[PDB]
Amino acid sequence: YSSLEQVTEALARAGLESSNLIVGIDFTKSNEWTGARSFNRKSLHFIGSSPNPYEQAITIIGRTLAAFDEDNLIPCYGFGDASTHDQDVFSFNSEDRFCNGFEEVLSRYKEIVPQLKLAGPTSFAPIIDMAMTIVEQSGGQYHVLVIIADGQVTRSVDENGQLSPQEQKTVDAIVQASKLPLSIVLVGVGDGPWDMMREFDDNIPARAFDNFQFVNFTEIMAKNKAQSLKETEFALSALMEIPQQYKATIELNLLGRRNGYIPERFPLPPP
Ligand SMILES: [Mg+2]
Numbered sequence: 001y002s003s004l005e006q007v008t009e010a011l012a013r014a015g016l017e018s019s020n021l022i023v024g025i026d027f028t029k030s031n032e033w034t035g036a037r038s039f040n041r042k043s044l045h046f047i048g049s050s051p052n053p054y055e056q057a058i059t060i061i062g063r064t065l066a067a068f069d070e071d072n073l074i075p076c077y078g079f080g081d082a083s084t085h086d087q088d089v090f091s092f093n094s095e096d097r098f099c100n101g102f103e104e105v106l107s108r109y110k111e112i113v114p115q116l117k118l119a120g121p122t123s124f125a126p127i128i129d130m131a132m133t134i135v136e137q138s139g140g141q142y143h144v145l146v147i148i149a150d151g152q153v154t155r156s157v158d159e160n161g162q163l164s165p166q167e168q169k170t171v172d173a174i175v176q177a178s179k180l181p182l183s184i185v186l187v188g189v190g191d192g193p194w195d196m197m198r199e200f201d202d203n204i205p206a207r208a209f210d211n212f213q214f215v216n217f218t219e220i221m222a223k224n225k226a227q228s229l230k231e232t233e234f235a236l237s238a239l240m241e242i243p244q245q246y247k248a249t250i251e252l253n254l255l256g257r258r259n260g261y262i263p264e265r266f267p268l269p270p271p
Pocket residue numbers: 020069070071072073
């Protein structure tokens with residue numbers, strides 16, 4: 001495809017209807033160096049006059065999905081900074097006020113970044129748990145959770161086939177989320193590594209439907225072709241499987257139904 005528009009129309013013809021976007025941003029301290037090869041020895045969270053990789057990912061995906069929400073309200077969270085670590089997420093806005101389209105996700109982000117202290121370690125359990133509450137409170141409406149991160153879930157130290165506590169909770173959160181009408185997209189930005197990644201998806205337990213997808217933003221953005229086509233490939237690789245998961249949610253009677261056993265997660269305020 002040559003534009004995001006062709007991608008947008010491709011989701012639409014594949015059966016995609018109303019879809020609410022949720023964004024979670026990685027604020028781990030590794031973002032200082034993971035831009036070594038991929039972002040010219042700059043911090044991934046560097047704010048200049050060019051968009052950094054988080055800003056690019058947000059822009060491309062927010063644009064491709066803008067058509068599927070009338071109000072474009074995007075619940076927007078950070079995690080991995082000093083206030084949250086691997087335990088919580090924080091709202092971009094006070095009182096967990098959702099963002100107005102990706103453009104307010106973008107502007108609000110740049111305001112927030114230089115007021116953080118990047119921390120760690122890395123778990124996606126809190127952001128996934130957060131998106132589950134939002135889905136449940138929405139009354140079972142279809143959501144796409146897009147997680148944008150610069151590394152895989154923290155594994156401190158135990159080859160002999162055991163899971164780190166972060167891995168365990170993340171994998172638990174992914175499986176548990178398959179009970180809801182929700183698609184989870186992990187976007188990998190920066191140098192990574194992202195090698196051990198679809199061997200990770202190999203150890204996610206069986207689910208009613210395949211609610212999880214990893215996409216490597218860096219890898220795509222590195223190929224030798226027009227900026228447009230890189231952007232199209234990323235949008236498509238990120239989202240090509242979401243219509244099929246949306247249908248899955250219908251055939252399992254998840255949509256429009258409330259689950260009843262989803263604990264209410266609360267977001268820390270923006271720092
Ligand atoms: Mg809406």
